[PDB]
UniProtKB/Swiss-Prot annotation, chains A, B:
Top-level class of the enzyme under EC nomenclature: oxidoreductase
Subunit structure: Homodimer.
Additional notes on this entry: This protein is similar to the oxygenase domain of eukaryotic nitric oxide synthases but lacks the reductase domain which, in eukaryotes, is responsible for transfer of electrons to the ferric heme during nitric oxide synthesis.
Swiss-Prot/TrEMBL keywords: Heme, Iron, Metal-binding, Oxidoreductase
Its EC number(s): 1.14.14.47
Binding site for heme: C65
The organism of origin for this protein: Bacillus subtilis (strain 168)
Protein name listed in UniProt: Nitric oxide synthase oxygenase
Name of the encoding gene: nos
GO process terms (BP): nitric oxide biosynthetic process
């Protein structure tokens, strides 16, 4: 019965994958092999080629992602061989180093052993591999509010943050068999951070803002042909608005707009002055400038949408249906200046894909 | 059968309307009267109270409208008595004058006789009562591109535009029985326009931009209890982004961002400079400033969203379900600075409401 769902998904993925790889003649035999592997074992194991192409398809099918033009150049690291927490740790350290690539960010995914019985082999607690802690007590807010629950769970495990606004959370994950996760402090040498300065407002550095170089999302499940890779961290480079319009701007995040308005020398008193809008534009300019100045990859939302238009065109040329989530594809600043805003998208879910899964804490 | 749809809609509207008006005891008799009016006549006629409250409900149910807090103060003009094109014309002139109110804009709707057999009594061709013409020929673009087809239809009827970028289209409508619409030039004394200047960039006036004071949407059908008022022009005041982020900004409209960038003294060469975003903010500041300076009502998108939050709260307090279209409710600049962006809305259609209908030209 679960053998059935698995087999069905397998037939559909293998057929599609092999067509795309020009290997359509090998399908029958491969499905035969898989069919008996499922009977005898309960599961099946992807070839390296299948796993690589599956991860790329999953990115291509991610409706909410504007960065999909580059789906076929995803760097896929196969870590299905790991068995120990030291190996997991070192694989995560390695992912950080190789994805960072001295600033010339490589889109990368590291794939850990998949769920067996729905039983996880490796369970990653981090939302992203590099992320700042958050604290709230006594009406005192420090750091990133979105990290409050994970921060508190880490401090239950004997970690202690310095309570700066930018404490790096340790890696935290649990191995099958263990009742508790282990945690490891990130080596600072591995983590590139970018101080935020503005191209012509010198006082902007007074805000002492920074952000980390590489977003490495580590809590989503990659699903490929019925196999559930719950631990499969991946990264791209940032689109600047993620940092300047949301992480640093949102009232429930770092909430910096009023401070930005002050350092750029504008009043923050009247809605009709559009001071929040002006502050947003200057903060977003500063973020792009700062990343570029430091030699860390980043994309602005106009260039990103132009790339996404090419992705739409490429999909059409290939005979593939395009799917998308308009509400996530439009950027949070000047959305109507992009073509995305002016068209609609079919939000159907196609697999392989990346999926949310329940947090193991909270 | 059509008598059936009508009766059903009637039962539902009358029940709801009278509950809201504290008149629940009068429903049975009123429905009885309506029931036989439908049998004998094929239709029924709203009382003035029903028509007024119905128009207000229709605004309250308009999913795409951020301005709904003020639904209950809609000024409803009952023009079901009109029979001639001179009366229609004068009613439209009157709507302009009274809605404008010397700049202190009154949200108003003028309701004309409804469809009878699905046969229109009055068919308005204008999209808005005040709107600029558009021309395209020989790769020459003049005025508002969105008005190109209506402009060409008017010029088929013997009207001729001066081919400025801001020619006012004449009122154009057709009476039942007539094969062609008639058109009437707007009296310039009735039409307030606002020149666009910037609060501190003096050269902004070099763009010679302007826009009209009052958006009076004249091509939607108001539906109330099964009765179809295809001709029922209404207006609010503008939210500034409608003008500065869309009408003046869109590449398929006045396409002014590159000219804005030049007059504000910034380069328009690199996406990463976010020059379009900065241009958008300055243009939008200029629009709000200009309207305010001239004493014409307008709302900025932050204040508008704050009002809409109060509308959500009021709906909850009243026990009414809230409906909305997130994709139209978010403003086209700094949307993530509004609460709207951070929640979802049920996009169900509730009646009474306003609906699209097919254009009578093109
Ligand atoms: C190469 C640079 C990349 C850029 C610039 C980019 C850009 C973005 C942006 C802006 C979002 C929306 C985020 C938000 O609003 O919070 C997003 C969502 C997403 N991206 Fe990409 N992305 C890139 C690479 C990748 C890669 C390599 C993958 C996976 C292999 C991926 C998968 C996704 C997924 C799954 C989401 C949706 C996450 C969710 O629903 O919470 N992206 N991307
Ligand atoms: C009082 C000031 C008002 C403001 C500031 C306001 C604001 C807006 C805005 C910004 C939109 C979106 C327009 C677009 O993106 O093109 C909108 C849509 C709409 N508004 Fe309002 N509005 C107001 C009054 C009214 C009134 C009086 C009515 C009717 C009685 C109305 C009915 C609607 C409808 C039906 C739509 C959707 C139109 C469509 O689907 O094309 N609004 N409103
Ligand atoms: N630039 C990129 C590349 C890949 C991405 C993949 C996923 C995401 C979305 C991450 N945010 C999900 C929603 C969320 C979750 C947890 C905390 C938050 F503040 C927000 C952003 C990405 N950005
Ligand atoms: N003229 C306008 C004004 C406001 C607009 C606001 C948004 C849009 C986007 C059109 N894309 C719609 C996405 C969508 C809409 C409705 C249902 C969906 F599932 C998805 C177009 C607009 N055009
Ligand atoms: N401020 C207001 C008040 C009422 C409104 C009622 C309706 C509308 C939407 C009008 N635009 C509809 C889409 C459209 C149609 C025709 C030409 C266009 F450029 C765009 C805007 C409103 N704005
Ligand atoms: N953390 C983030 C990042 C991007 C976002 C982008 C958009 C939103 C809006 C949530 N509202 C969704 C509206 C919607 C979504 C999906 C289907 C619908 F019918 C309507 C929240 C976001 N949160
Ligand atoms: Cl992020
Ligand atoms: Cl308009």
């Amino acid at each position: 019965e679960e053998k059935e769902i698995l087999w069905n998904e397998a037939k559909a993925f293998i057929a599609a994958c092999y067509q795309e790889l020009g290997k359509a003649a090998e399908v029958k035999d491969r499905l035969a092999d898989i069919k008996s592997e499922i009977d005898l074992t309960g599961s099946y194991v992807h070839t390296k080629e299948e796993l690589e192409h599956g991860a790329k398809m999953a990115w291509r099918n991610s409706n909410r992602c504007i960065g999909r033009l580059f789906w076929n150049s995803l760097n896929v690291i196969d870590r299905r061989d790991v068995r120990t927490k030291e190996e997991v740790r070192d694989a995560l350290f390695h992912h950080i180093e190789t994805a960072t690539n001295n600033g010339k960010i490589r889109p990368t995914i590291t794939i850990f052993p998949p769920e067996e019985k729905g039983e996880k082999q490796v369970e990653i607690w981090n939302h992203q591999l590099i992320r700042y802690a958050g604290y709230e007590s006594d009406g005192e807010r420090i750091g990133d509010p979105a990290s409050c629950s994970l921060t508190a769970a880490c401090e239950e495990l004997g970690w202690r943050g310095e309570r700066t606004d930018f404490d790096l959370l340790p890696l935290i994950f649990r191995m099958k068999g263990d009742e508790q996760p282990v945690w490891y402090e990130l080596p600072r040498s591995l983590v590139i951070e970018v101080p935020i300065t503005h191209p012509d407002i010198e006082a902007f550095s007074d805000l002492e803002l920074k952000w980390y170089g590489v977003p490495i999302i580590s809590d989503m499940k990659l699903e490929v042909g019925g196999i559930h890779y719950n631990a499969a961290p991946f990264n791209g480079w940032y689109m600047g608005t993620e940092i300047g319009a949301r992480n640093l701007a949102d009232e429930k995040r770092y909430d910096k707009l009023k401070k930005v308005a002050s350092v750029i020398g504008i009043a923050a008193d009247y809605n009709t002055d559009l001071w929040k809008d002006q502050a947003l534009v200057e903060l977003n300019k500063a973020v792009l400038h700062s990343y570029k100045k430091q030699g860390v990859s980043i994309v602005d939302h106009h260039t990103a949408a132009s790339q996404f238009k090419r992705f739409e065109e490429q999909a059409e040329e290939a005979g593939r249906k395009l799917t998308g989530d308009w509400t996530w594809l439009i950027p949070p600043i000047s959305p109507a200046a992009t073509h995305i805003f002016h068209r609609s998208y079919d939000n159907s879910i196609v697999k392989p894909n990346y999926f949310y899964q329940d947090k193991p804490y909270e």
